[PDB]
Every structure is written in C-alpha cells, then in structure tokens.
Design a binder for this molecule. Structure first.
Ligand code: NI
Ligand code: NI
Ligand code: ZN
Ligand code: ZN
Ligand code: ZN
Ligand code: ZN
Lengths: 59, 59
C-alpha cells in the first residue's frame, strides 16, 4: 500500500521514527533527531534557515 | 518532508526496499520480497487472493 511518511530533509532517512523536528515556517521541512542535533547551521537545505522555529512532533 | 512510500500489506515494513511485489487486481496492495516468498495466501488481507497476478516493480 501507498503510505504518507516523513523523510528527513537533512539526511533523507525515511520514515523518521518516534518524533520529527518540524519547521513552522517552511512548507514541508522535517529533520530527524540526529540531524536536528548535529547539522551545521550554514549547511541547512535552502530555503530553511537557522532562525526558523522548530517543533518536536510525535510520529 | 512528506513522502509517498510503499508499505508492505503482509508485514507493514515501510519503505519496501529493492522491489515490491505488486497486485495487479487490488487497488493498492504490495508485498515486500520476504512476505511474497514465505506468506501463505490465508495470511493475506482480504480482498486480496492467491489468484491475483503479482508483478515485481523496482523501488
Ligand atoms: Ni507544518
Ligand atoms: Ni497498481
Ligand atoms: Zn536526518
Ligand atoms: Zn524552515
Ligand atoms: Zn512484508
Ligand atoms: Zn490482490
């Protein structure tokens, strides 16, 4: 079956499991826990920027 | 990001990797390689039946 899943925009892991750090500003941007913790601020995929508020959403 | 992935109707693994055994008759039915090889038809969710032709589709 076809299933909607969240894929990390930092590392392309899919599905993100347990929780996803979601951008409140971008249209459709999510990070897994590891990317949220380790991705460098100047290496975020544009147009996401480091000032965008992120929220932890249960999967 | 939101992403369409294939989820196995036999074991619920998602994404199916490599290839998916896809039902030609049902609306949206897929098995991973492992389920296709070892699950008996009585274990598969109605309305899928053993006479439905299945085709291997690369992921
Ligand atoms: Ni949102
Ligand atoms: Ni089809
Ligand atoms: Zn990631
Ligand atoms: Zn953003
Ligand atoms: Zn399976
Ligand atoms: Zn079927």
């Amino acid at each position: 079956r076809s299933s909607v899943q969240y894929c990390c925009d930092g590392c392309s892991t899919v599905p993100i499991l347990r929780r996803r750090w979601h951008c409140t500003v971008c249209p459709d941007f999510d990070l897994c826990e590891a990317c949220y913790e380790v991705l460098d601020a100047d290496r975020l995929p544009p147009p996401h920027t480091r000032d965008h508020p992120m929220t932890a959403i249960p999967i």
